[PDB]
Amino acid sequence: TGIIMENVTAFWEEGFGELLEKSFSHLCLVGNPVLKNINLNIEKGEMLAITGSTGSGKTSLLMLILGELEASEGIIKHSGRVSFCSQFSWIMPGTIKENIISGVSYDEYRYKSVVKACQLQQDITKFAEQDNTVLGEGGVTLSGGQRARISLARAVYKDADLYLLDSPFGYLDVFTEEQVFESCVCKLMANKTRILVTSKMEHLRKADKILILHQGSSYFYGTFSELQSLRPDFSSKLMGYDTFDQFTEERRSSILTETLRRFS
Numbered sequence: 001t002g003i004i005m006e007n008v009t010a011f012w013e014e015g016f017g018e019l020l021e022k023s024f025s026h027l028c029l030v031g032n033p034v035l036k037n038i039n040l041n042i043e044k045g046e047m048l049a050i051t052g053s054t055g056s057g058k059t060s061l062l063m064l065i066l067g068e069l070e071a072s073e074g075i076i077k078h079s080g081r082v083s084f085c086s087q088f089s090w091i092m093p094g095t096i097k098e099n100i101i102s103g104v105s106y107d108e109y110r111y112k113s114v115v116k117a118c119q120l121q122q123d124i125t126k127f128a129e130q131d132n133t134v135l136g137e138g139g140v141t142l143s144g145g146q147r148a149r150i151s152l153a154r155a156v157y158k159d160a161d162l163y164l165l166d167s168p169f170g171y172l173d174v175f176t177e178e179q180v181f182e183s184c185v186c187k188l189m190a191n192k193t194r195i196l197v198t199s200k201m202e203h204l205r206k207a208d209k210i211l212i213l214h215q216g217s218s219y220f221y222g223t224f225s226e227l228q229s230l231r232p233d234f235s236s237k238l239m240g241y242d243t244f245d246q247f248t249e250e251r252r253s254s255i256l257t258e259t260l261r262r263f264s
């Protein structure tokens with residue numbers, strides 16, 4: 001399914017802040033806009049890369065689609081099931097397999113396809129019981145990347161029309177992340193409409209459409225090509241690094257924020 005948003009604006013509402021964590025009263029009382037004048041038209045099977053300064057409304061735009069935040073003005077169109085992969089990688093009690101499948105029908109081919117694509121084979125091969133290894137609530141002894149890949153495999157394995165992947169790529173095993181983005185987001189999901197919140201420039205370059213947010217506002221919307229010519233200042237600075245995508249998640253967002261605060 002495709003997804004369209006025409007001149008959308010969403011204001012803070014009670015509770016939304018609580019959900020966001022998983023003050024706010026003032027933002028609600030003041031009728032502050034969490035997202036203002038957002039426009040985007042994503043065709044079926046396309047990939048939308050969302051980035052921007054820290055705390056710019058990336059996760060909120062997602063909640064907007066999940067319907068957890070209402071659109072005070074504007075039109076938002078999209079239909080079908082939507083699968084959501086939150087920034088917080090959760091792990092319920094049970095095996096690695098059980099965690100990837102949860103409440104979905106088991107299809108061996110579908111399953112092994114997703115595990116392989118998410119680069120989980122390199123992990124489970126390390127355990128005596130492989131993907132039948134038992135995890136505890138939170139998968140505490142696993143690495144941040146391992147937890148994200150399983151969390152990501154769960155969202156991906158779910159059959160949906162629209163996938164919302166919030167920042168799955170932000171940990172130290174940066175090389176594995178590059179493989180995962182190529183194999184899973186780019187190949188196995190090539191025909192699935194998908195939105196990826198990211199702070200890696202490669203992802204903007206491979207995307208079909210790009211949305212850069214700053215202060216809940218749309219700093220830029222278009223193709224990676226349109227970005228270089230219509231925002232050379234921003235473009236030049238971020239492309240100016242040799243290996244920006246290998247900096248830590250925090251440095252990338254820091255450079256992104258400062259660049260955004262600078263060029264209006």
Ligand SMILES: Nc1ncnc2c1ncn2[C@@H]1O[C@H](COP(=O)(O)OP(=O)(O)OP(=O)(O)O)[C@@H](O)[C@H]1O
Pocket residue numbers: 020021034053054055056057058059060061
């Ligand atoms: N934990 C929090 N505590 C306080 N305010 C928050 C918190 N999380 C979000 N907010 C508020 O909500 C606004 C939008 O946050 P949102 O999570 O949508 O942004 P984001 O761009 O996804 O953030 P980030 O870059 O941290 O992941 C922020 O500008 C801030 O006012």
Ligand SMILES: [Mg+2]
Pocket residue numbers: 058059087166
């Ligand atoms: Mg976020």
